[PDB]
């Protein structure tokens, strides 16, 4: 019940998938790269004044990539925004607070 930490890991779903695609354009311009599809597999959530998502996406070869996305609170609206990526990461890393 770590009062500010990230939840244990959860197998990805299509919601976590709608995010990676909604913030696709946003990751695109920062690395300047072009991906056919970011494919989420793992994720953690965390309670801030909103929820941060720590998603594990697959890029090209056999190496994965990490993504911190802030997700607004019902009140404000349904937003989303890359706040921090973590390109060039390993196949098997724990998702870790960054």
């Amino acid at each position: 019940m770590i009062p500010g930490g990230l939840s244990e890991a959860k197998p990805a779903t299509p919601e976590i998938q709608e995010i990676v695609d909604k913030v696709k354009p946003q990751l695109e311009e920062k690395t300047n790269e072009t991906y056919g599809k970011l494919e989420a597999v793992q994720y953690k959530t965390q309670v801030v004044a909103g929820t941060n998502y720590y998603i594990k996406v697959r890029a090209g070869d056999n190496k994965y990539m990490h993504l911190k996305v802030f997700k607004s609170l019902p009140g404000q609206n349904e937003d989303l925004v890359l706040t921090g990526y973590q390109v060039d990461k390993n196949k098997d890393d724990e998702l870790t607070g960054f």
Partner: protein, 254 residues
């Protein structure tokens, strides 16, 4: 002992008790819960003579590694112990001016800049700096406000009412579940949801709506969410762990 208790009504001369802070993009709820109760308790304990908004930046950046992992979690019972050991400076001081060490991590509610991206900026625990950010007098190690003792409260409904009524708001923690971000009115009660994670908050009283006995709580996410900042959660059963994590302490000098 009373049926209904609200600290904002019992000690109205203390701004901080009616104030809601915006925690931003990082998991410092543990730091806010502690410094806001501590802020509250300093006022109550001096009869309003001293009104300060104790430094959340200080708790976060100067307890640092010893109280958790900054913006990635942390511990209530540790934030409070550190107030006792090394104390905390300000980030809001009453008669207007401005605090010693205010909260630099930008907020998540408001909009600002030009088109909504509120947070998504620094979100990176800054360093400990035993300096007041300039313009505030006096000096850091003199703005320091200390605690006498700190202790856990018991998983008991009455001890909690008795800690609040006798000494002021306290800190606690519970488990958030997606149905909770949806909160607006009434007494919250967990029914479904994905386990989002563990959050920390400020309990400041009690009462009943229809039949449900609740705890008055200040969330740290700004004033649009919920009830102008606050909510009510089921009180009686330790519902989501809200009784299991209660911690307080008593201010030093007064």
């Amino acid at each position: 002992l009373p049926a209904s208790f609200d600290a904002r009504e019992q000690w109205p001369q203390c701004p901080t008790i009616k104030e809601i802070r915006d925690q931003g993009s990082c998991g410092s709820c543990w730091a806010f819960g502690a410094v806001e109760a501590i802020s509250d308790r300093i006022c109550i304990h001096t009869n309003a003579h001293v009104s300060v908004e104790v430094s959340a930046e200080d708790l976060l950046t100067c307890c640092g590694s010893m109280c958790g992992d900054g913006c990635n979690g942390g511990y209530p019972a540790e934030a409070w112990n550190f107030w006792t050991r090394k104390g905390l400076v300000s980030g809001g001081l009453y008669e207007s001016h401005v605090g010693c060490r205010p909260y630099s991590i930008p907020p998540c509610e408001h909009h600002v800049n030009g088109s909504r991206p509120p947070c998504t900026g620094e979100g990176d625990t800054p360093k400990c700096s035993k300096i007041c950010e300039p313009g505030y007098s006096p000096t850091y190690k003199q703005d320091k406000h200390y605690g006498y003792n700190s202790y856990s409260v018991s998983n008991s409904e009455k001890d909690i009412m008795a800690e609040i009524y006798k000494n002021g708001p306290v800190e606690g923690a519970f488990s958030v579940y997606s149905d909770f971000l949806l909160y607006k009115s009434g007494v919250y009660q967990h029914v479904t949801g994905e386990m989002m994670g563990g959050h920390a908050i400020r309990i400041l009283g009690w009462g009943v709506e229809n039949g449900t006995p609740y705890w008055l709580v200040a969330n740290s996410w700004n004033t649009d969410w919920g009830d102008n900042g606050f909510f009510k959660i089921l009180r009686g059963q330790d519902h989501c762990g809200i009784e299991s994590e209660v911690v307080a302490g008593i201010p030093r000098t007064d």
